[model samples]
Target chain A: TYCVGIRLDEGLVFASDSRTNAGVDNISTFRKMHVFEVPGERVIVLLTAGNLATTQAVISLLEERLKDPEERLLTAPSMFEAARLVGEALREVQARDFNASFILGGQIAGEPPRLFLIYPAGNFIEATPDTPFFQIGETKYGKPILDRVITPDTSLEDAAKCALVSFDSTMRSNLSVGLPLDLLVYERDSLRVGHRRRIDEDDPYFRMLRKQWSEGLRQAFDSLPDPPW
Target chain B: TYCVGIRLDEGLVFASDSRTNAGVDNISTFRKMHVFEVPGERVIVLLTAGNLATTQAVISLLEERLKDPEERLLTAPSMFEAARLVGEALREVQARDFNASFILGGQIAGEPPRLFLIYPAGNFIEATPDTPFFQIGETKYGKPILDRVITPDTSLEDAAKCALVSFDSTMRSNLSVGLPLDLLVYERDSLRVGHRRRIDEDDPYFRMLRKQWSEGLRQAFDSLPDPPW
Candidate 1:
């Protein structure tokens, strides 16, 4: 299972869990995030969920077609065109895996940062002001935090923090999803990759953030007045 | 949609939203909680979710069975027996509507307080120490807080507070769940009902709790250290 995507005024934030499983006992780590960045020109990130084999095949196909001059993500004129290219790729391979879902987001030098949730059927939906984020796979446990904190005007830092907290909640509730986590932040108009990091179990900063979040929630709960009755 | 039921060392806490709708415009409020309290002997609470007509019919049948002595819920030997009776009741009505679910929790004179999640198929699962709470409808939005805060040792008041906060989160994200919540708390070994409140749009305590919880969460988010990058 995977989650974490946000479209903020500053840019977009994406995170994905690396855990995958064939069965309950057969588990392994597989990165579900792919970044296509041309420094100072474009930075498009794709986060995937569903069958790993199918997603891998789709990703490989996307990479293979990057050389196509007529229609390819690398040469797309706008985010909309890029989204269409990704959708068409999925459509081409839908027979192999009709269950995978993708989140495509990035900036194309001249256009504003955009976000889209591409479905298995090759159709997609874009993020809007009222709904500035999209998530796929094991989405619920982590949604409350995002629904509570994310907004179009939220700063990039706050969005990233919210995404981690959301991921933390999901990891605690679902054994199927685990670390190390791939976190990428794309700065609007930068046309280059922003800050990106891989958080493992031993990562001190994530460990600290997790501890502080737990403590903070307890404090918040304690601070609320108990039932007056 | 509905949510929340906790089995703690001190007792049990159950709360559910009253909103129900046949469609986007056909919304109405109906109590989803039913209590069978034979003070000093047993206190059984049932929270229902799914097709309102089906749940309402099941509840009506359960109420009708009160007159029967051999196998009625009021005369059950233990919380387990009560759960079985509820499951059977649902099975009896399964042909009527196959979409209803229930959470049954309470204490019998000789047994500890217990909880069970009864499915639409009449099968059920009991709440264990590891998962001391069971939610019925629209469950995901409110689950994170319970996963983080609830345990066998959590106090009744704390669990109740957490349930409301969880419901607040759900209501914010789901339009199908709305105002006028039915909240009931049962203290362990009391064999009687604890505090029960009907919260509406103008309820001051609920209003305050909701406001404070949002503020608390924002503060907690702000207190967490930003990414170290």
Candidate 2:
């Protein structure tokens, strides 16, 4: 399954199509975005969800376009246009099969870094303060956390922590949503992405993050007061 | 939207389908067996979803079958056979409309009370201890609560609370999963069924349940110890 995520100032808007078939575990997975970067200032990054082949194709397609000096989503006039270009790219890949979707997010050059999730049909929306993030693919099980936490102006470091926590929750609840997770960081005004990594099962920080978040939640659940009478 | 619930020893199994459509605020609702109760000494109840008219016909057809004192689901010798009659009744309903899925649950005298979700094609599956319940439509949003609580051995009162909490959450997150909710409480080994009600916006107990659960969750969130940096 493919997973996608995006973050924006207004909040996060996520869309994931549910259509996946793998041997005996055929099911639907929504595409969503997850961003790790300083909120509103220095850095931002994203992840996506969808059919693996389709997502890979979209990533490669975006990479090739980004490589072009004349046509980079980064160089685009507005984040909205950048989102549109991402959508077009998705439609192009979908033209190949009509059964794939792409979820993406990134930071712009100077603006308080933002993330936008692109969909299979070339339409997209941004994440904002009211809803600070978006996710796709095996998202339901992981949603309660983001809904419970996450806000605009949350520090980049804290946002990163939130992403790790969120991903750990998703991975634990679903089998189709697995690693290694593709992650990127975009510092505010730093056109160049930062600290990009593929977090495999052995990644120490991710493992620790996972362990901490799960235990933290379990602890929280235990401590919460039960109903009165 | 109509909601009903059941509890058993394995675990609470809640089922709901997602199918809500409204036209520009002008409304029409459909989903068979939103609430259907067959009354008498050996009371049998069914909650339904998908295609309302079809479900209504299924219910009507079943009630018609009740006219036959010698042969009816309520008089079946075994829970399994009673369930079969329910499935066959659904099949007969389909013979007229060719649509509808009814989730049948209730009791027959001198036999173990059981629940079976009957399909449009006349097939059915019994709820087990592992899956102590089943739902018919708009199910996801309310699932987490049941997952967190509600096990077989959960007292009927607590199960009622769990069901109300689950429905409250669903109604909050989704408009199609609306009110009035149909609630039923069945004591284990009780061969007769009763104590079901249609919960509407004004029901004081429901209001209290919603407010209490929401407050409890907020308190839970507050009590969630901050991540030890």
Candidate 3:
């Protein structure tokens, strides 16, 4: 399961949990985040969710296109074109095994910053002020925090915090969504990749953040008034 | 969209959001909770979620059976029988219009308290210690709080509080689930109806609960440490 892509005032924040399972006994870790960076030209990050085989095929197709130097994510003129390129690549894979969703976010030279959630049908929707985030696969458990905390004006750091909290809630409620999360924070207009981190079970900062959030939630629950009747 | 039901050592708690919508423009509220009380003999509560008409039809069929009273819910010998009766009735409605799910809980004379979540197919599963809650319709948004707060030993009042908090989270994130909730708390071994309340937007206690919970959540989020990196 995956949660990804937050569009904030400062930039876009992307995160995804890496646990994939065929059954309870066959759980494995796989990276769902793919970064396509061309230094100062364009920096696009693609996050995948759904069938691992399908997502991997789509990513491989996109990576294969990178070598052609034709119309690809790296060569796309605008963020919109890059989104289309990603969408088409997803569709190309869907033509064989169609069961994956992709979140694409980044800047292409002159563009300010953009985020798009691409569907299995090859259609996509861009993020807007009212809807500043796109999440897929095991989404609901993590959604309340994002719904409450994220807005177009939210700072990048705060959005990152909220994203971690969101993932924390999700992992607590769902065993299928486990650790080794890929987190990338893109500073808008950088036209270059920003800070990227892999948060695993042993990552000290993530462990501390999870502990603090859990304690905070318990405190919040305890503070609420009991039933009046 | 809706969510309902919790189980506790004391007895059971049931709740459901009443907001129904055919479209974004057409939204209305209706009662989704149904009660069957033969005081001191048996007490059964049913909460509905999904296709309004189908649920209404199912409830009407159960009510009609009460008149003849041969082997209906009132005459059922045990909670297990009552659950089967509800499941059969659900199937009866599904044969005509199949789109509603039900959470049925109660204690019949000579039996321990029990809770069952009836699926549209007429099959159902009983609540256990680990999985003491059952939710239907727009369930995910409200599930994290329940997963975090509910245990078999949770008091009826605390269970009720958790249910409301869960509904509050769902309502905040989803427009399809809105105001005017039905809440019922049953005490074990009583074999009769317990406390019941209709919580609307104007209901004072509910308003206070919502306010305190929101404030508590905001405070909790604020108290969490920021990203160290």
Candidate 4:
């Protein structure tokens, strides 16, 4: 799995791969992005990577607690508080050969959008302007594109595009990461998830993007001169 | 170090970065691509990665033995034999942290050119058409370009270009992989190293590649349509 969460001045973008394998021979498609929102009130999204069963169990426990009126992701007042809440829940499940990492992001009514990285150890860090994006799992192949393109001032649309490009590069080189991405874009202060998309193999936009980018890269290669041997 | 060794029907390409560091603060340049040839007989080049001290000692040992009447890399009659000889030397060093990996490749008098991935464990495997390239040390960031472009039938020039692109992407994303890349291209049946160049920050071809590829990527990215927002 390759998951990227970016926070720009305009908003936040979450992109995640949906492929999971129980060993290389047995493959499954499971959505890694979980989006929760009470329209115009709050929107919180978290992406999971590693140890499918452990993550599923953690999510189940958290959702089970939301029913008990405890301070939880959907009910948290700020993005920081929600990050802490999720981190604590993750810690409990982790205590129960369970390695997992997460990217937690979203907006509440009063504050700006934010993104956090949650480790399997239950420790976490927020993304700051100096490093405004977080990527987990199969990260290196997808990282150069993000470093080259992402900035705090980038538009939400451009951030989303760059995130997909990042994923496309990763999927091309790694079998652990694959299609049917969940991409959710949230505008700051809009206080809700605006454009949430499930991009599949047949999605025309993605197909076009892949074709054009491949050609562009070949042309880029051809444009460079041979070393003056 | 970021080292890439590619086997093509036309020839072989070896590219490696020269930067090594102690911790994160102290930096130095050490050539990782060692070139050896007895013109008209063999053109064998090997690349190094991982623990600097161990690789240094192993190279010193091999060079030390060459002075004796022992069979060595320069004296080996076949590519396979040289691979075995190097693997044995590496095994001794492993017995003596001391983790290192190598790409040993080139042509011997009677056989076609070949590439081998010599592990820190001293086990080794040759490159086949199914997997035409071997990358080591900070590999993932540079791998997609190689996977996308390399093939058994690729020309030496094209393979070299793709290898540079791979390094360019890697250096941009990783500080450990840096400049002064030793780029060597060996042509089939040439019986010698044909194009061996030291590419530094000021090298015209490399600078142009970095600039043009950066712009080309941005243009390529902007050319893609936004999600049907």
Top model by lDDT, which number? 4
Q: TM-score of each candidate?
A: 0.94, 0.75, 0.93, 0.95
> Which residue runs does candidate 4 get wrong by more than 4 Å?
A23-25, A66-70, B21-25, B66-70
Let me know the DockQ for model 4: 0.78
Ordered from best to worst lDDT, the candidate numbers read 4, 1, 3, 2
C-alpha lDDT of candidate 4 relative to the true structure: 0.87
Give one digit per residue, the lDDT tens place, for model 4 in B1-229. 8999999999999999998854457788999999889899889999999888888887887787435443678888788877887888888877764588899999987799999999878889999999999999899999988988999999888899889889988988888889899999999989988889898889888888788888888887787777668
Candidates in order, interface RMSD in Å: 1.2, 5.5, 1.3, 1.2
Model 3 is docked with a DockQ of 0.74
Q: Chain B, candidate 3: TM?
A: 0.92
DockQ scores for all the models shown? 0.74, 0.21, 0.74, 0.78
Clashing residue pairs in candidate 3, if any? none
A64-91: candidate 1 lDDT, tens digit per residue: 8437674767888888888888888887
Least well predicted 10-residue stretch by lDDT in candidate 4 chain A:
A64-73
Report the TM-score of candidate 4, chain A only: 0.95
Recovered share of real interface contacts in candidate 4: 0.84
Q: Least accurate stretch of 10 residues (summed lDDT) in model 2 chain B?
A: B10-19
- lDDT by residue (B77-96, candidate 3, tens digit) is 77677778778887877776
Instruction: Report the poorest 10 consecutive residues by lDDT, candidate 1 chain A.
Output: A65-74
Score chain A of each prediction against the true chain A by TM-score and list the results: 0.94, 0.70, 0.93, 0.95
Per-residue C-alpha lDDT of model 2 across residues A1-229, encoded as one tens digit per residue: 4343535443332223233553256554432333333443323333545555766676677667336553544456556666776777778877773344444455544555555666657798776667666666566555554655566655455555556655654555356556666654344455444445556679777776655544554453344333332
Decoy 3 TM-score against native: 0.93
